[PDB]
């Protein structure tokens, strides 16, 4: 009945804060270095980790994440490396969902990928190029293997499509928006549903995270974590510490 | 009858086509679809398009019996559907006129489009100049640096051109960047996509704008030969020219349909663009269709001496027709294509596009197979003025 | 059906009297083969089977009829006149020159000739001739000057892909004339098997009449089309004028329509006052040149003056004798258009209608815009768009600063 | 009435020889030097001199003569300089005709050129691009000013056109051209007693003697231009050899 991420957003709202949701791509700068970074997010205060599956044609990603995923693919990263990362995070006590474009999932086998994500301790899937309209197989696999399904909404979303995307989502809805567009989009979700809402808005600072925690249930950070890891692992730790404190404001 | 369902799926549960796009693009995709559904049955729109097809683009294109090829085709009778004579020099004008008229009917003031070596960019900039639309072409940085004159054509036509330096800097990445533009600028922008692929409505809409090739060809061949052909063939990149010529013949059970796709150095070599012969099913650029991809589903580098057939995907309507057994898809190498290019030059005085030469090479082999007196219609999708330098190098004339 | 011969010359090829325009100012050495082509053309021009053959190629191979397009977005720049473009830019090979070469190459096969020769400057007539020879299985030899050859590498390669032999003449000034000179002499030596395919409505008789007859189709189609779209005959029909094949071809059908103004536009280069021009009628005078009595650019002794134009096809110091006759008779006006006027029109046509014209054709567009201003709102002007501008993109891009340095 | 050149051929035929007919273009290598060369021809035994008017577009000029005429025109040569060369040749006791393409005559005035050429001592006109069919003004000028008119015939000339060209010629008829040349001369003899000159790229004593068996005049041009280019002594020596060649006994 309850979603897998339901308890995490309960714990956050009980402690007067939003959830810090941190994205990193598998295999950047290489596979072991990327797992050390994902484990260091759990140690540094991330509540949920988005494990990125590098894709050769990531249309919704900007050049910070795209160049990292290109480097990861040049280094020979494989989809299976993403499931090993999900296991390393779970064993370290963290809470992991996967963000992936749909073709790698189709190529794996949808049912097979969901089974194997579940067996790794993975709690859900974020699906930026899968809409509920094409999600028949995914809905079946999601129920079967008890994974959350985080669909995206946008500022342009029609009233009818927003309600349906929200109704098809479990765990949280990703309000993607990359001044007042983000909080209005969050308001439009709240008017039809009490499902948690995460907001990505190119956050790079403590102050930016605090502003988003005032209305959104989750603060999603991606690009800035990748930029930090490029400088070094201690820069990632320090930046994650600043964001973990931002969400408590 | 041959149309997809309302979600854009061909063949029901196989689920070819569809919409594999983010939610961010769906407002404008529903808008284009509603607009297209409205204008396809509007007499004013079809009249406008027919008037432009006739007086501006030069339709109908002729069907030409290439009698001097016959001896090189087992004495079969090769008829060339001459899309090479259209304004701009290829079938692409059919597509961009339809989409640009739609853009203006929708109230959009800006049109974007992708291009490889320049053909679809030039075609799109042509239709935007005609209709007063603002035009921005996206082109991979590897292509802009070696296609300066096509960039200049586009600029002379009033279009802006953006060199795309992201990803692998070629066609697929130009399409990815045009996609990102359209996500941000959908209020005022229309994406004029250049083949029968992409999410619903693009495969259906592009095909409908290209159907005229087949409708004319079917009439002209009954007129000239006295009967339906034994085969109709075409080269296949994304699939627009092939589907255009094939469509009117789909319910003629004695007409063989053969799509010829680029095999580069050979299918066995890993340097090809043979999407059906060597690819596999997946979601790419908004559609579930065939795709050149590795084991994890990552897109791989395509290779052909032809730039127009260099696209690693293929349209979902073709995937459905392959599954149903209606159309056969066969590989043609660089060597076979260039031999046919030269032969069409020496025998008929027609310089084909290298894309189109794949179809001619395929027709020569089919002629030998079918034998004397067989009637083969070939879509001569473009002229080869753009390929004179490539062909001259191949044959050692420079 | 073979059309009436009311505007034709006498049997010596003279327009306007027994010693008027045209004729044959050629050596006795060429006369046997000239008489042979003249008799062959007399026989075949009235042959229904020849005209069926030519029409069948015109239709299925070359793509005729070409359309007539109302360029509504040019109207504002032409004093709100209505500019209709006769679209020879859509012909196979991209110009009106295909109409001529198909006719003459058919005629060569009728005469029993196995081999065709021609010459070319920039290369357009060489490609057209090589195209027609490949189609009809004729051996083709194109004569081109070494200066033209080395600066037109792609057109040379086009001709070779088409199966033609290109002969780079490496003697004298290595330009158009040394090529011609060698062609003329090839013809004489191999006359029993060789036909000479001349590229414009000029030369000795029968060439001005024959070439014009193979281009009459343009004006014939256009006369029908404009009455369909405009509802009436045009106020004017205009065209660019090199040697004059495309202009005479569109003009002819309108000759006996007394309300229709006929205007030929010629290349003024940097300006008629600069001595870097090809404004044959504007600055030239009557004389014998390249086989005919016509107008040419000539000095006080009668030596031919080098012409100049940004366009290759208009860069010719002479003009066909039928145009000389029509000028003397007051039926057609001929006016100068500069490089700049033409290039402005080129760019304008690209931006407004999405048609990239040949720079030759842009002189006609440029002149059509001025005539629209003179004639005014609602006037109907048919313009021959003799070719497409793909060959001219590099020249234009340089002009408009689109390449840089 | 008899032709202007009739008495030269009468005199040659009585001495069992052909007339030597020598071509040089006015203004090659410059004007004074060409006049000195033409004079030297008269002194070295040329019976008739062909004075060439350089023309920008000469159809019937071989490479040697074309380069030479191009050079003459580059040096500023004028049609009036050809008239002055005619006077110099008349002054030196020579006999001159002018060889010219038709446009310079048209530009000058056809009657005007005939009058001024006649006044200068000129005996006739060779017209390589004027055929009888366009010669009406020229026949009238030719009769008025007592100038000979030398049209060309060729190996390919039809019977009808040959007879018309011979009938329209006065003085001699130029047979321009294996055995093609004596066959052509034979065809002229069959319809007319008019003297026939033969041009054949003659460059030696032996070639002149071959032609003198069957023809009344031996025309030499290219070899004189080639010799002059070397110098005036070479031209004198060669003309001396050609004069010996035309003499049979
Ligand atoms: N997110 C997401 C998808 N990862 C990219 C690769 O597929 C991106 C994408 C790119 C292009 C298209 C597209 C193609 C043709 C017409 C209209 C379109 F929108 C769709 C999606
Ligand atoms: N002697 C002499 C004339 N001077 C030369 C150029 O003026 C030469 C000439 C040669 C050939 C032609 C010609 C042109 C078109 C069709 C057929 C032809 F034969 C014209 C002139």
Q: Does the C15-62+98-215 domain belong in CATH 3.40.50.1100? A: yes
Using CA atoms, how far apart are residues C143 and C178, in angstroms rounded to an integer?
A: 9
Question: Considering only residues 10 to 39 of chain C, which have any Cβ-Cβ distance to chain D shorter than 8 Å?
Answer: 12, 18-19, 23-29, 31-33, 35
A20 to chain B, closest Cα gap in Å: 24
B26: Cβ contacts below 8 Å, ≥ 6 apart: A131, A156, A157, A158, A161, B19
Residue B268, chain A, CB below 8 Å: the answer is: no
C287 to chain D, closest Cα gap in Å: 6
Q: Which two tokens stand for residue A126?
A: 């974020």
The residues of B annotated with a catalytic role in the active site are 92, 114, 381
Q: Which of D116, D134, D151, D199 to mutate to test the interface with C (most CBs of C within 10 A)?
A: D134
Ligand 1 mutation pick, A56, A61, A129, A174, max ligand atoms within 8 A of CB: A129
Contact (CB<8Å) D106/C287: yes
For CA atoms B291, B294, B297, B302, the dihedral sign is: negative
Q: Tell me, in angstroms, the distance from the centre of ligand 1 to residue B244's CA.
A: 23
Give the N- to C-terminal CA distance of chain B in Å, as an integer: 52
Q: How far is CA B142 from the centre of its chain?
A: 21
Q: Which two tokens stand for residue C310?
A: 């940004």
Q: Tell me, in angstroms, the distance from the centre of ligand 2 to residue C99's CA.
A: 22
Helix (H) or strand (E) holding B216: helix B212-225
C167 to chain B, closest Cα gap in Å: 14
- Residue in B with minimal Cα distance to A64: B166
What Rg value do the Cα atoms of chain B yield, rounded?
20
The DSSP-derived string for D210-236 is HHHTT-SEEEE-HHHHHHHHH-HHHHH
**Smallest Cα–Cα separation from B233: which of B219, B215, B220, B214?**
B214
Which residue's structure tokens are 């004027």? D130
> Which one of 3.50.90.10, 3.30.300.130, 3.40.50.1100, 3.60.21.10 gives the CATH number of domain B58-91+211-398?
3.40.50.1100
Give the pairing of strands B16-20 and B286-291.
Answer: antiparallel
**Smallest Cα–Cα separation from D125: which of D66, D83, D92, D167?**
D83
Contact (CB<8Å) C351/B157: yes
Question: Considering only residues 30 to 69 of chain B, which have any Cβ-Cβ distance to chain C shorter than 8 Å?
Answer: 54-56, 58, 61-65, 68
* β-bridge partners, A96: A49
Half-sphere exposure of C112 (CA within 13 A, CB side): 5
Contact (CB<8Å) C172/D67: yes
Class of domain B10-57+93-210: alpha beta
Residue B19 Cα distances to A181, B46, B200, angstroms = 25, 27, 6
Q: Do chains D and C touch (3 or more CB pairs under 8 A)?
A: yes
**Smallest Cα–Cα separation from A42: which of A99, A2, A96, A115?**
A96
The residues of D annotated with a catalytic role in the active site are 50, 61
Annotate C118-131 with b (16+ C-beta within 10 A) or e (fewer). bbbbbbbbbbbbbb
Q: Which two tokens stand for residue B308?
A: 């127009």
- C97 a catalytic residue: yes
Q: Which two tokens stand for residue B305?
A: 């001496």
Specify burial of residue A205 (Cβ count, 10 A radius: 0-12, 13-18, 19+).
middle
Using CA atoms, how far apart are residues B134 and B189, in angstroms rounded to an integer?
A: 9
| All CATH 3.40.50.1100 domain ranges in chain C, comma separated | 15-62+98-215, 63-96+216-405
Q: Phi and psi at residue D210, in whole multiples of 5°? A: -60, -45
Which residue's structure tokens are 């072991």? A32
Q: How far is CA C260 from the centre of its chain?
A: 21
CB-nearest to A106 from B172, B173, B283 is: B283
Neighbours of C383 (CB within 10 A): 36
CB A219 within 8 A of CB A243: yes
CB B156 within 8 A of CB C350: yes
* β-bridge partners, B79: B65, B377
B86 to chain A, closest Cα gap in Å: 34
Specify burial of residue B124 (Cβ count, 10 A radius: 0-12, 13-18, 19+).
buried
Of the candidates A47, A61, A81, A148, the residue annotated as catalytic is A61
Using CA atoms, how far apart are residues A226 and A135, in angstroms rounded to an integer?
A: 30
Using CA atoms, how far apart are residues B10 and C34, in angstroms rounded to an integer?
A: 66
Q: What domain count does chain A have?
A: 1
Half-sphere exposure of A224 (CA within 13 A, CB side): 22
| Chain A residues whose beta carbon lies within 8 Å of the beta carbon of residue B173 | 57
Question: Considering only residues 100 to 139 of chain C, which have any Cβ-Cβ distance to chain B shorter than 8 Å?
Answer: 130-135, 137
Counting DSSP H helices and E strands in chain A, the numbers are: 12, 9
Asked whether B308 lines ligand 1 (CB < 6 A), one says: no
B148 to chain C, closest Cα gap in Å: 8
Give the N- to C-terminal CA distance of chain D in Å, as an integer: 30
Using CA atoms, how far apart are residues A29 and A37, in angstroms rounded to an integer?
A: 10
* β-bridge partners, D220: D22
Neighbours of C292 (CB within 10 A): 32
- C311 a catalytic residue: no
Helix (H) or strand (E) holding B356: helix B354-370
Q: Tell me, in angstroms, the distance from the centre of ligand 2 to residue C293's CA.
A: 12
Using CA atoms, how far apart are residues B7 and A248, in angstroms rounded to an integer?
A: 43
Using CA atoms, how far apart are residues B337 and C315, in angstroms rounded to an integer?
A: 39
| All CATH 3.40.50.1100 domain ranges in chain B, comma separated | 10-57+93-210, 58-91+211-398
Q: Phi and psi at residue C130, in whole multiples of 5°? A: -65, -35
3 state DSSP class of D174 = strand
| Chain A residues whose beta carbon lies within 8 Å of the beta carbon of residue B186 | 156
C5: Cβ contacts below 8 Å, ≥ 6 apart: none
Class of domain C63-96+216-405: alpha beta
| Chain B residues whose beta carbon lies within 8 Å of the beta carbon of residue A103 | 282-284, 291, 293, 297
Asked whether B199 lines ligand 1 (CB < 6 A), one says: yes
Q: Tell me, in angstroms, the distance from the centre of ligand 1 to residue B205's CA.
A: 17
CATH number, domain with residue A127: 3.20.20.70
Determine if residue A203 is left, alpha or beta; phi over 0 gives left, psi from -120 to 50 gives alpha, anything else beta: beta
Q: Tell me, in angstroms, the distance from the centre of ligand 1 to residue B21's CA.
A: 6
**Smallest Cα–Cα separation from D24: which of D57, D80, D72?**
D72
CB A146 within 8 A of CB B18: no
| Chain A residues whose beta carbon lies within 8 Å of the beta carbon of residue B279 | none
- Residue in C with minimal Cα distance to B220: C60
Using CA atoms, how far apart are residues C24 and C203, in angstroms rounded to an integer?
A: 8
C1: Cβ contacts below 8 Å, ≥ 6 apart: C48, C51
3 state DSSP class of A220 = strand
CB-nearest to C90 from B85, B157, B389 is: B85
Neighbours of A169 (CB within 10 A): 25
Q: Which two tokens stand for residue D86?
A: 């005619």
Counting DSSP H helices and E strands in chain B, the numbers are: 15, 14
Alpha helices, DSSP H, located in C46-174: 48-56, 97-110, 124-136, 146-150, 153-161
Q: How far is CA B73 from the centre of its chain?
A: 25
**Smallest Cα–Cα separation from C142: which of C114, C158, C166?**
C166
By what technique were these coordinates determined? Answer: X-ray
CB B25 within 8 A of CB B15: no
CB-nearest to D129 from C26, C191, C301 is: C26
Contact (CB<8Å) B299/A56: yes
- C341 a catalytic residue: no
Domain residue limits at D207: 1-249
Ligand 2: residues whose CB is within 6 Å?
C 26-27, 30, 184, 196, 198, 203-204, 207, 289-291; D 57, 59-60, 128-129
| Chain D residues whose beta carbon lies within 8 Å of the beta carbon of residue C25 | 102, 129-130, 134
| Chain C residues whose beta carbon lies within 8 Å of the beta carbon of residue D130 | 25
CB C123 within 8 A of CB C144: yes
Q: Tell me, in angstroms, the distance from the centre of ligand 2 to residue D175's CA.
A: 19
**Length of chain C in residues, anyone?**
405
B194 to chain A, closest Cα gap in Å: 18
Give the pairing of strands A173-176 and C261-269.
Answer: unpaired
Ligand 2 mutation pick, D54, D58, D59, max ligand atoms within 8 A of CB: D59
D103: Cβ contacts below 8 Å, ≥ 6 apart: C287, C288, C289, C298, C302, D55
Q: Tell me, in angstroms, the distance from the centre of ligand 2 to residue C316's CA.
A: 14
Residue B290, chain A, CB below 8 Å: the answer is: no
Using CA atoms, how far apart are residues A60 and B180, in angstroms rounded to an integer?
A: 7
For CA atoms A140, B293, B161, C358, the dihedral sign is: negative
CB B143 within 8 A of CB B120: no
């Amino acid at each position: 009945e309850a979603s897998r991420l339901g308890p995490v957003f309960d714990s956050c709202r009980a402690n007067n804060r939003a959830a810090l949701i941190g994205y990193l791509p598998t295999g950047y700068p290489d596979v072991p270095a990327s797992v050390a970074a994902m484990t260091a997010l759990v140690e540094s205060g991330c509540d949920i980790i988005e494990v990125g599956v590098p894709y050769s044609d990531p249309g919704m990603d900007g050049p910070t994440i795209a160049r990292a995923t290109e480097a990861a693919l040049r280094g020979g990263v494989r989809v299976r490396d993403t499931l090993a990362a999900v296991e390393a995070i779970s064993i370290a006590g963290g809470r992991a969902v996967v963000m992936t474009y749909w073709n790698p999932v189709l190529r794996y086998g949808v049912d097979a990928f969901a089974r194997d994500l579940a067996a790794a301790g993975g709690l859900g899937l974020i699906t930026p190029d899968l809409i509920p309209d094409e999600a028949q197989q995914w809905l079946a696999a999601s129920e079967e293997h008890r994974l959350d399904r985080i669909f995206l909404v946008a500022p342009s979303s029609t009233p009818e499509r927003l309600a349906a995307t929200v109704e098809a989502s479990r765990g949280f809805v990703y309000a993607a928006s990359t001044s007042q567009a983000a909080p209005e989009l969050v308001g439009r979700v709240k008017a039809v549903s009490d499902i948690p809402v995460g907001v990505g808005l190119g956050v790079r600072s403590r102050a930016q995270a605090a502003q988003i925690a005032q209305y959104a249930d989750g603060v999603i950070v991606g690009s800035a974590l990748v930029t930090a890891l490029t400088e070094g692992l201690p820069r990632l730790r320090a930046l994650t510490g600043e964001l973990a404190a931002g969400v408590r404001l | 009858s041959h149309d997809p369902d309302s979600g854009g799926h061909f063949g029901g549960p196989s689920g070819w086509g569809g919409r594999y796009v983010p939610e961010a693009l769906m407002a404008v995709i529903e808008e284009v679809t509603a607009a297209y559904q409205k204008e396809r049955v509007s007499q004013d729109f079809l009249d406008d398009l027919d008037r432009l097809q006739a007086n501006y683009a030069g339709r109908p294109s002729p069907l030409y019996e290439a009698t001097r090829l016959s001896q090189h085709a087992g004495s079969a009778r090769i008829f060339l559907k001459r899309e090479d004579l259209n304004h701009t020099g290829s079938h692409k004008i059919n597509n961009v006129l339809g989409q640009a008229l739609l853009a203006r009917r929708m109230g959009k003031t800006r049109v974007i489009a992708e291009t490889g070596a320049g053909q679809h960019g030039v075609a799109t900039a042509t239709a935007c100049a005609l209709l007063g639309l603002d035009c921005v072409i996206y082109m991979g940085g590897i292509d802009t640096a070696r296609q300066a004159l096509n960039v200049a054509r586009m600029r002379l036509l009033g279009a802006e051109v953006v060199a795309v330096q992201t990803g692998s800097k070629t066609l697929k990445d130009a399409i990815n960047e045009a996609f990102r533009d359209w996500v941000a600028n959908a209020d005022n922008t229309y994406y004029c996509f250049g083949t029968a692929a992409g999410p619903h409505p693009f495969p259906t809409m592009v095909r409908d704008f290209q159907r005229i090739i087949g409708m004319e060809a079917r009439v002209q061949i009954q007129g000239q030969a006295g009967r339906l052909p034994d085969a109709v063939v075409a080269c296949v990149g994304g699939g627009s020219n092939a589907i255009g010529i094939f469509h009117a013949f789909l319910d003629d059970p004695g007409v063989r349909l053969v799509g010829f796709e680029a095999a580069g150095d050979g299918v066995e070599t890993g340097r090809h663009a043979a999407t059906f012969t060597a690819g596999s099913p997946g979601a790419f650029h908004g559609s579930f269709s065939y795709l050149l991809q590795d084991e994890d589903g990552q897109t791989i580098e395509s290779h052909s001496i032809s730039a127009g057939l260099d696209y690693p995907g293929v349209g979902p309507e073709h995937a459905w027709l392959k599954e149903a057994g209606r159309v056969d898809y066969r590989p043609i190498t660089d060597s076979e294509a260039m031999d046919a290019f030269g032969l069409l030059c020496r025998m008929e005085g027609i310089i084909p596009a290298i894309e189109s030469a794949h179809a001619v090479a395929g027709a020569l082999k089919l002629g030998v197979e079918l034998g004397r007196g067989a009637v083969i219609v070939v879509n001569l999708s473009g002229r080869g003025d753009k390929d004179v330098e490539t062909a001259a190098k191949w044959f050692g004339l420079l």
